[PDB]
Design a protein around this ligand. Structure first.
Ligand SMILES: [Ca+2]
Lengths: 602, 343, 215
């Protein structure tokens, strides 16, 4: 009666990709033959399999496909008695995610570069500062070769790329090549505030801490000059320049405002302080910079990035507001308000607060404005931003809706999360909703699929979702019901999950001061069967550079940035719900999601 | 592109090929031969043949203790900001605390905290910070430098002047109570240099040779060769004085076990003409160290240092006079017993 | 004053090491966690070492552990800060700084080993030594004037022992000495490839880099 095929919006080479094939209003067993071909040409058969479909499994089939590597499109075709579906889907060559660890962030001419490539046939390339290739080749993931830097070379930021054979997208890592000596001390800086007021009257301070690499305080003096960084260019304040003593490794540098006004009588830029510390003996010095102090009107910024831009008239709308500091770091415990809806909440640690908004039934368009309301801030120093959400278009003006509801906050693996199916529409159609179909999406692949019975009268249906580490760093929950074998009603929601390691890795030690040559004994606690890679670096190397290094947070960042879903959920209509969540859909009544323009989110 | 390349190097005995459908480095300055069947760039670095920022004048005059006097001037168009005068003490010397403390409280100045023992600032490296150095007239400061401990050989100290907007460009001067310039004394010919000691080594006399005590001298660690030589001619190359000499006899032989087949060069500064009273065609007793050797031509050359022993050896004409005769024997015994037995 | 024959000067200062890989083939506990004790010796550097461990597990993806620190120190020691490179025949001053971390007042002998490649205070016969005191929890700078006479890497070594005690230290660091001139850079030509051949004739050591590209 109605047949549906769901696949991820983009398909990856060489990895198990689960797909969904469903039969609505058909109580008859059948075998289904399913093929994938290159498109438009249909030259070679890329994958094939036959699967059993029965009332035993609720007429639902979840097979997996693998496309061996051989803009580029494919066609998933499925056929059997009564069934003929075909979806054209975009292909990506990024089979998995690659990350490059390097030995250190800075090298001298004529030294080696030790590196590892990790994966969540591969080749690795080395590029010069001028952007000229100098290495390329297949890499044995059990064995890497150090790369030898020539005695005469170009100085500056090189880059290393790791990729699959015929892919246009990559992971890139950096390292500097400089004629440098390691300094005997680190300098750490502490700003007075995380921001500077464009039109304020406060001074700006920087606390300098200078300590030798083995622990004692440094004695000496510091030279600090303040400036402004306009996109790329740095524009100094020549009368900032002050010399201050560093006594017992401590010192405080101060930029006066009337000195700042005198030179700047600014929007969208940052205050920087450049700091040069010298030992009392004159033996060596260190140069670091305090950056990212945005010149602003408000200490905060409001964002609507985590709210759906669509609503369901007559159902309560879930507004998820997000506040950060100017650098974009979450700002916790910040009260937010929307006057027009007399709504009010305060920000959790993740920087979010959930506000439920009651909306009229005849609204097609919904405009929202949110203000910070911080106890310690004058009105004109609060932050605000505006948005307007637009109503989900029902299929053929039917008035039938679906809403998925989550009240749980700061989601971590281990939890059991209530997920609500909230349904609304005409009494005639509602009495036909016999089940719900749901899809869990993680890392751009369809992770799990299940069914949720609805009995008659049940317009609120709650089920449980148990969260494992498989859902890190975030997952999408998408659901739909179908009415009388041709209307589809759908919703989706985006759920953040706490970004830890999927497993566990600790390096345990005694923590006592040691002696050159002393016997050391360290402990490694990890998962059974883990390959662990180690390195020891003189702390003096972090002093000089630390922005290129690998970290768990960077792993999860890049993986998120390559999510095929582009939206915080819901959509224009049935079609858009799937499109925005990174899905493809084709039915037997040609309900087809449009073609995906680019793999990287609009 | 459907290429197939091949490069020929006089360097490599077999040429290199690569299918362009890339780098190779040498250590030579030769013609390349390329064959195609794309763009190429070739790079060839070689070594091709003081104080732009400040004027620095550092003297140390005598207090009739020493007065350290420093004068500086920025050579820029505008007064330099936030300039630094980096000072090291002569060995066993220490700043008069009272003076240094007066300088420390100066309007536009700063110096770090220092401890004090009996009017002696407890710092060997002293750094004075100034807000500005003038670009138009010289700026000077002075203070007394106090002799704490007596010492053989004072190491000269140094003064560096540099400013905030020019840290990499450092102007350095040295100062010594004896050597005006404070530079360690050395000798160079063409481009190669060796240490000289500073103390100008005088010729030896030497009335009755204590032959046992002399063997002892010519047998210590640092004595590698012992020759009898002949002063053929005196010249002046890059290094002011060249004494050309010929090895007449070999009494003890250096690691280079082979002399006498090559004319030797002995080199000393014009400031040393007086004390080394070498005359042409006179015979000389010479021994020294092979750490004094200075490479050149096919010829073997050393430089005259305090490790070099120089004594005139009379001629046979001379070896009949009442004054010279008992010494000629002394020289004959010495040669004989050293050459026949070793140490 | 113990003999400098006794004190073996530290010299092993890598900027990174322990570049090893490692399987947790041990069995998990109640917690499902596997454990691997490992031994090594520290190198010579007085500093803190950060040890970073990153692991991969078939179903648990990749994981970057928290860094683990190792402070390595002494009670009394030398810190020699050297420039990247120095020019042949030019006179320079290097400043070793001595650290006293004991809460007493000490008296100290500092000697700079002779080397034939330099011109300095130290002569073959005797090393330029000096004796002087250091106050409680303090440090004292020590200048050395040398003159490089040879290009290349050439050790500078300094040794210091305290008096009436057993605390000493020695440091050996290689100094880089470079040719007297300014390195000059000729792009011998920029040619293209439209069987075609080409000869490119002859244009302080020398290097020559050969770059051919695709277009
Ligand atoms: Ca997350």
């Amino acid at each position: 009666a109605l047949y549906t095929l769901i696949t991820p919006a983009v398909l990856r080479t060489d990895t198990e990709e689960q797909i969904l094939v469903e039969a609505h209003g058909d109580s008859t067993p059948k075998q289904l033959d399913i093929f994938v071909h290159d498109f438009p040409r249909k030259q070679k058969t890329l994958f094939q399999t036959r699967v059993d479909m029965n009332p035993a499994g609720g007429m639902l089939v979840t097979p997996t496909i693998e496309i061996p590597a051989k803009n580029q499109y494919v066609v998933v075709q499925v056929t059997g008695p009564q069934v003929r579906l075909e979806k054209v889907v975009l292909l990506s060559y990024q089979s998995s995610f690659l990350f490059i660890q390097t030995d250190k962030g800075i090298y001298t001419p004529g030294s080696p570069v030790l590196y590892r490539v990790f994966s969540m046939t591969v080749i690795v390339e080395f590029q010069t500062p001028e952007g000229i290739l100098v290495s390329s080749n297949s890499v044995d993931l059990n064995f890497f070769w150090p790369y030898n830097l020539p005695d005469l070379v170009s100085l500056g930021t090189w880059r290393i790329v790791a990729k699959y054979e015929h892919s246009p997208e990559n992971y890139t890592a950096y390292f500097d090549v400089r004629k440098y000596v390691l300094p005997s001390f680190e300098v750490r800086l502490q700003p007075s505030e995380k921001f500077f007021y464009i039109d304020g009257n406060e001074n700006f301070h920087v606390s300098i801490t200078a300590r030798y690499l083995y622990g004692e305080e440094v004695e000496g003096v510091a030279f600090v000059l303040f400036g402004v960084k306009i996109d790329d260019a740095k524009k100094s304040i020549p009368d900032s320049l002050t010399r201050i003593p560093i006594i017992d490794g401590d010192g405080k540098a101060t930029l006066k405002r009337d000195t700042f006004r005198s030179r700047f009588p600014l929007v969208g830029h940052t205050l920087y302080a450049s700091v040069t510390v010298m030992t009392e003996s004159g033996s060596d010095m260190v140069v670091t910079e305090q950056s990212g102090i945005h010149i602003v009107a408000s200490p905060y910024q409001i964002h609507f990035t985590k709210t759906p831009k669509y609503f369901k008239p007559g159902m309560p709308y879930e507004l998820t507001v997000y506040v950060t500091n100017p650098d974009g770091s979450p700002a916790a415990h910040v009260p937010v308000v929307s006057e027009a809806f007399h709504s009010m909440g305060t920000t959790l640690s993740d920087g979010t607060a959930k506000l439920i908004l009651n909306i009229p039934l005849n609204a097609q368009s919904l405009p929202i404005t949110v203000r910070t309301n911080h106890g310690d801030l004058p009105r004109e120093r609060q932050a605000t931003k505006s948005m307007t959400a637009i109503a989900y278009q029902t299929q053929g003006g039917s008035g039938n809706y679906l809403h998925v509801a989550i009240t749980s906050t700061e989601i971590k693996p281990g939890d059991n999360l209530p997920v609500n199916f909230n349904v609304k529409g005409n009494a005639n159609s509602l009495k036909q909703i016999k089940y719900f179909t749901y899809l869990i999406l993680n890392k751009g692949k369809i992770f799990k699929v299940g069914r949720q019975p609805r009995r008659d009268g049940q317009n609120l249906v709650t089920m449980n979702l148990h969260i494992t580490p498989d859902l890190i760093p975030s997952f999408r929950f998408v659901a739909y019901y179908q009415v009388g074998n041709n209307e589809i009603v759908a919703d989706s929601v985006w759920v953040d999950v706490k970004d830890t390691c999927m497993g566990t890795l600790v390096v345990k030690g005694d923590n006592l001061i040691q002696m050159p040559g002393a016997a050391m004994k360290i402990k490694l606690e990890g998962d059974p069967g883990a390959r662990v890679g180690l390195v020891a670096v003189d702390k003096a190397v972090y002093v000089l550079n630390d922005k290129y290094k690998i970290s768990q947070a960077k792993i999860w960042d890049t993986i998120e940035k390559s999510d095929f879903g582009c939206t915080a959920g819901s959509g224009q209509n049935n079609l858009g719900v799937f499109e925005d969540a990174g899905l493809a859909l084709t039915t037997s009544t040609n309900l087809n999601t449009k073609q995906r323009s680019a793999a990287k989110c609009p | 592109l459907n290429l197939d390349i091949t490069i020929e190097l006089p360097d490599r005995e077999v040429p290199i090929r690569y299918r362009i459908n890339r780098t190779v480095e040498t250590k030579l300055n030769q013609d390349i031969t390329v064959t195609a069947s794309a763009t190429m760039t070739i790079l060839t670095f070689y070594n091709a043949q003081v104080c732009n920022k400040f004027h620095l004048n550092v003297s140390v005059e005598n207090i009739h203790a020493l007065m350290l006097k420093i004068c500086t001037r920025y050579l820029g168009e505008v007064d330099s900001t936030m300039t630094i005068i980096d000072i090291s003490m002569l060995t066993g010397f220490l700043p008069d605390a009272e003076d240094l403390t007066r300088l420390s409280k100066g309007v536009d100045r700063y110096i770090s905290r220092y401890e004090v023992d009996n009017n002696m600032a407890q710092k060997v490296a002293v750094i004075i910070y100034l807000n500005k150095v003038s670009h138009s007239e010289d700026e000077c400061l002075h203070f007394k430098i106090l002799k704490h401990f007596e010492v053989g050989f004072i190491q000269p100290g140094s003064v560096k002047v540099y400013s905030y907007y020019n840290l990499d460009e450092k102007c350095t001067k040295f100062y010594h109570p004896d050597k005006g310039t404070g530079l360690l004394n050395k000798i160079c010919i063409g481009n190669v240099c060796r240490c000289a000691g500073e103390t100008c080594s005088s010729l030896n006399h030497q009335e009755r040779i204590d032959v046992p005590l002399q063997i002892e001298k010519a047998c210590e660690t640092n004595v590698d060769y012992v020759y009898k030589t002949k002063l053929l001619r005196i010249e002046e190359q890059d290094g002011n004085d060249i004494y050309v000499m010929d090895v007449l006899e070999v009494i003890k032989q250096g690691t280079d076990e082979n002399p006498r087949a090559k004319t030797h060069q002995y080199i000393s500064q014009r400031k040393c003409q007086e004390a080394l009273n070498l005359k042409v065609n006179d015979d000389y007793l010479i021994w020294g160290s092979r750490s004094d050797l200075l490479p050149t031509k096919d010829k073997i050359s050393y430089i005259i240092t305090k490790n070099t022993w120089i004594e005139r050896w009379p001629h046979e004409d001379e070896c009949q006079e009442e004054e010279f005769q008992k010494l000629c024997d002394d020289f004959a015994q010495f040669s004989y017993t050293l050459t026949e037995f070793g140490c | 004053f113990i003999a400098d024959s006794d004190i073996i000067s530290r010299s092993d200062f890598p900027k990174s090491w322990l570049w090893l890989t490692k399987d947790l083939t041990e069995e998990p506990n109640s917690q499902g966690i596997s454990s691997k004790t490992m031994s090594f010796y520290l190198r010579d550097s007085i500093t803190t070492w950060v040890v970073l461990a990153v692991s991969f597990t078939p179903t648990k993806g990749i994981c970057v552990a928290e860094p683990y620190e190792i402070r390595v120190m002494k009670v009394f020691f030398i810190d020699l800060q050297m420039p990247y490179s120095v020019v042949k025949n030019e006179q320079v001053e290097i400043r070793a700084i001595l650290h006293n971390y004991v809460n007493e007042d000490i008296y100290v002998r500092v000697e700079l080993l002779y080397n034939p490649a330099f011109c300095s205070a130290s002569t073959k016969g005797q090393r330029y030594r000096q004796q002087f005191p250091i106050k409680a929890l303090s440090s004292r700078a020590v200048p050395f004037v040398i003159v490089p006479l040879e290009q290349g890497l050439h050790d500078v070594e300094i040794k210091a022992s305290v008096q009436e005690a057993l605390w000493s230290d020695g440091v050996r660091k290689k100094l880089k000495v470079v040719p007297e001139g300014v390195q000059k850079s000729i792009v011998t030509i920029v040619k293209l490839d439209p069987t075609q051949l080409e000869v490119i004739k002859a244009r302080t050591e020398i290097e020559t880099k050969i770059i051919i590209q695709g277009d």
